[PDB]
Amino acid sequence: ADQLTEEQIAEFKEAFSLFDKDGDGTITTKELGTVMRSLGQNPTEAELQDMINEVDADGNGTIDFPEFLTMMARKMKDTDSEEEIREAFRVFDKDGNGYISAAELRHVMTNLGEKLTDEEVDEMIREADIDGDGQVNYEEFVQMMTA
Template sequence: MSPTEGEVNEMIEKVDCDGSGTIDFPEFLRMMSNQTEDFDHETEIRETFRIFDKDGDGYISAGELRYMFANMGQKLTDEEINEMILDADIDGDGRINYSEFFRLM
C-alpha cells in the first residue's frame, strides 16, 4: 500500500524538526519508525535497512537514498543526499552500513 501525496506531506510535517520544509536523513528515519511502531524495534530497523539497500550489498549508497526519496515524491539534490550520507557515515566510506543505520534509529 502506497501513501498518497497528502499522507506523505503530513508525515513530513510531523518530523520536520527544523521547519525547512524538507526532511534530512535522521528526520526521515523518525518518520519511518513512526509508521511501524507496532513491530519489534530491531526487526523494524532491519526491515527498513533492507528496503533502502536495494542491491542487497549491506550498504545504503547515495543512489539508493536518491531512489527511495524519489519514490516518496521527494526530489533531493546531490548536495542534500551527500549531507545525509555524511551525517550517518561513521567510518567515512561514503556509504551507510547497518551499524551506522541502527545508530541513527
C-alpha cells in the same frame, strides 16, 4: 525529557505529513499502504484496517494527527522498532551489498515523496557515515533511524 516536548511534537507532525500525502489531515488505508510499499511491505486490506482500528480513537476509520501523536508519544511494549528497522534497510540496500549508496538513498527518498538535491543526498550519506569509510553500513543506518 522522557517527557513530550514541543520539538518532538513538531517532528511527529513532519512524519504525519509524510503519510498524509494529500494534506487533508487524515491518513487513509490507501495512504498507509503506499508508505508501507515504499518501505518494502505489501499489507493486506485487512491488515491496514485492523492496524488503523487499534489507534482510531474516534472510530472514523482513518488516523488524524491527535491519534497519530497519541500513538507516537505512548510509553510502550513490543514496538517492533529494531526488527522494522532491520527490514526497512532492505529497500535502501537494493543490491544487498550491505551498504546504502547515494543512488540507493535517493531512490527510496523519491518513493517517500522527496525530490532531494545532490547536496542533500550527499549530506545525508556523509552524516550517517560515522566510521568515515565513505560508505553507509547497516549499523550506521540503525543509528540514523533512531536519531
